[PDB]
């Protein structure tokens, strides 16, 4: 589990969105595994605006933050999980690291701010849904 809280927005994995998220929906995209809902309070996270390929992510199944090198956001085939059938997921970055299903939502950050959240993974992999192209998260 986990979310990004920027401005009056809450960014979560679409497959972990709650009824309150869906009742206060701003934007969602199944192909990216992302959903954004509105919040009453303002958040503290800042979004990175960059092309970094190195950063640090939180792994809840280890209670640890790990430094990683990651690929640029791309369209990558992803195998079935409990939330989606095997399918192409867009705007996805891969790194070598540990990821179990409940690790979804952990933040990946670089020197500029938040880069994305955990969504995919397995056999020494972990995939992140990028948010650096969502420029509207910085306004309204």
Ligand X SMILES: Cc1ccc2c(C(=O)NCCc3cocn3)c[nH]c2c1
Give binding residues for Zn(2+) as ranges.
50, 52, 110, 112
Contact (Cβ atoms closer than 8 angstroms) between residue 114 and residue 94: no
Catalytic residue status for 33 = yes
Structure tokens belonging to residue 78:
């992803």
Work out which of 7, 24, 39, 52 binds Zn ion, going by CB under 5 A: 52
Which among 18, 108, 22 has a CA at the least distance from the CA of 67? 108
Q: Say which of 91, 103, 104, 130 is annotated catalytic.
A: 104
By beta-carbon proximity to ligand X, the closer residue of 15 and 112 is 15
Q: Say which of 15, 29, 45, 98 is annotated catalytic.
A: 15
C-beta of 134: minimal distance to ligand X in Å?
18
Residue 56 found at the interface with Zn ion (CB under 5 A): no
What is residue 11's three-state secondary structure?
strand
Residue 50 found at the interface with Zn ion (CB under 5 A): yes
C-beta of 50: minimal distance to Zn ion in Å?
3
What is residue 35's three-state secondary structure?
strand
What is residue 95's three-state secondary structure?
strand
What radius of gyration, in Å, describes the C-alpha atoms of the chain?
14
* Residue 52 binding: pick among ligand X, Zn ion, none (C-beta 5-8 Å cut-off by kind): Zn ion
Which among 24, 112, 98, 101 has a CA at the least distance from the CA of 57? 98
Q: Say which of 21, 33, 103, 130 is annotated catalytic.
A: 33
Binding site for Zn ion (CB under 5 A): 48, 50, 52, 110, 112
Catalytic residues: 15, 33, 104
């Amino acid at each position: 589990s986990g979310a990004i809280y920027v401005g009056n927005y809450r960014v979560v994995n679409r497959h972990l969105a709650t009824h309150n998220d869906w009742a206060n929906l701003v934007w969602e995209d199944s192909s990216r595994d992302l959903l954004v809902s509105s919040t009453t309070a303002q958040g503290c996270d800042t979004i990175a605006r960059c092309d970094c390929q190195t950063g640090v992510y939180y792994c809840s199944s280890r209670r640890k933050h790990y430094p990683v090198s990651f690929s640029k956001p791309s369209l990558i085939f992803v195998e079935a999980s409990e939330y989606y059938p095997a399918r192409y997921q867009s705007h996805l970055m891969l790194a070598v690291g540990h990821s179990e299903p409940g690790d979804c939502g952990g933040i990946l950050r670089c020197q500029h701010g938040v880069v994305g959240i955990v969504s995919t993974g397995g056999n020494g992999l972990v995939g992140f849904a990028d948010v650096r192209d969502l420029l509207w998260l910085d306004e309204e």
